[PDB]
Amino acid sequence: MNIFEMLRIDEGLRLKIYKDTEGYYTIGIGHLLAAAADLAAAKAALAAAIGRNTNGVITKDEAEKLFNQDVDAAVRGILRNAKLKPVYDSLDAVRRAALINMVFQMGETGVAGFTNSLRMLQQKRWDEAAVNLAKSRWYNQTPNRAKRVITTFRTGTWDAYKNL
Numbered sequence: 505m506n507i508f509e510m511l512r513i514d515e516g517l518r519l520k521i522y523k524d525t526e527g528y529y530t531i532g533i534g535h536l537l538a539a540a541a542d543l544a545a546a547k548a549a550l551a552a553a554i555g556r557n558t559n560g561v562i563t564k565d566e567a568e569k570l571f572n573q574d575v576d577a578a579v580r581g582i583l584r585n586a587k588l589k590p591v592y593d594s595l596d597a598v599r600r601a602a603l604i605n606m607v608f609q610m611g612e613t614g615v616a617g618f619t620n621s622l623r624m625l626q627q628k629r630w631d632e633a634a635v636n637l638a639k640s641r642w643y644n645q646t647p648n649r650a651k652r653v654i655t656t657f658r659t660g661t662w663d664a665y666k667n668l
Contacts, residue, residue: 505662505665505666506601507575507601507604507605508533508568508571508572509665510601510605510652510656510662510665511533511571511605511608512533513652513665513668514605514609514649514652514653515533515534515608515609516533517532517533517564517567518530518531518532518533519531519532519561519562519563519564519567520560520561520562521537521543521546521547521550521560521561523543523546527539527540527541529543529546531550531562531567531570532562532566532567532568532570532571533567533570533571533574534574534608535567535570535571535574537549537550537553543560547560550562553570554566554569554570575604578604578607578608578612579592579604581607581612582603582604582607582612585612585616587616587619587622588603588612588615588616588622590626591603591622591625591626594626595625595626596660598656598660598661598662599625599656599657599660601656602653602654602656602657603615605653605656606653609642609646609649610642618637618640620636621633621636621637624636625657630657630658630660631658633657633658634654634655634657634658637650637654637657638650638651638654651664652664652665
């Protein structure tokens with residue numbers, strides 16, 4: 505399993521350009537193309553990003569490419585972050601997947617705020633952290649995503665995502 509698939513599940517994948525209620529142009533896995541207006545403008549960007557002249561629809565491989573771009577950017581920022589870097593750095597690949605997922609959902613700052621939970625994580629206190637975290641507003645608001653992710657932090661496996 506992989507992070508793209510995790511996110512596919514948690515966030516969702518759109519293969520056709522979408523405009524939300526607040527005027528944003530998005531595609532793939534939350535890939536922001538453009539805020540206001542120009543569908544054509546949005547399509548223009550798209551076309552350039554994947555290196556192809558779409559009709560507004562892309563393939564999964566194409567989404568995966570934009571996503572990977574987005575994942576890097578996020579990891580960059582994670583690194584330039586002082587509350588986040590040592591955790592990331594100390595986590596295993598799977599668990600970071602989870603870390604990234606959270607960032608994708610709530611931003612670095614948002615994540616950066618789970619001081620205690622982060623601490624356990626860095627000191628490898630998995631059940632601790634897991635329990636800590638389930639007592640959160642985040643969990644109450646997006647419980648299904650919260651739970652998988654948490655469970656992921658717990659086991660360090662991808663099982664939460666294979667058993668749906």
